[PDB]
C-alpha cells in the first residue's frame, strides 16, 4: 500500500499510538513500542513457552 518500485522496501515495521508525532501533546512511552513483560520479546517468549532451544537442543 506504499508506492515504491523496489520490491519490499526495508525493515518491517510495528505499530504505535494515535496522535500527531510532533506538536506538544505529551506522547506516552509505553504506547510507542508494544513489548511489555509478555509473549512479545522472544526471549521471555522462549521460556513461558519453553521451546527446545533454551535447553541447548
Where does this chain bind a copy of itself (CB under 8 A)? 1-7, 9, 11-19, 21, 32-35, 39-42, 45-47, 50-55, 57
User: Where on the phi/psi map is residue 56: left (φ > 0), alpha (ψ -120 to 50), or beta?
Assistant: left
**Could you tell which of a copy of itself, another protein, none binds residue 39, using a CB distance below 5 to 8 A set by kind?**
a copy of itself
Nearest to another protein of 18, 36 (CB atom): 36
- C-alpha dihedral sign at 11, 32, 34, 1: negative
Nearest to 31, CA basis, from 49, 11, 16: 16
**Could you tell which of a copy of itself, another protein, none binds residue 23, using a CB distance below 5 to 8 A set by kind?**
another protein
Amino acid at each position: 500500500t506504499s508506492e515504491n518500485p523496489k520490491i519490499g522496501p526495508i525493515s518491517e515495521v510495528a505499530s504505535g499510538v494515535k496522535t500527531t508525532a510532533n506538536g506538544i501533546e505529551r506522547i506516552p512511552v509505553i504506547g510507542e513500542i508494544a513489548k511489555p513483560v509478555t509473549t512479545a520479546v522472544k526471549w521471555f517468549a522462549d521460556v513461558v513457552g519453553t521451546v527446545a532451544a533454551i535447553f541447548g537442543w
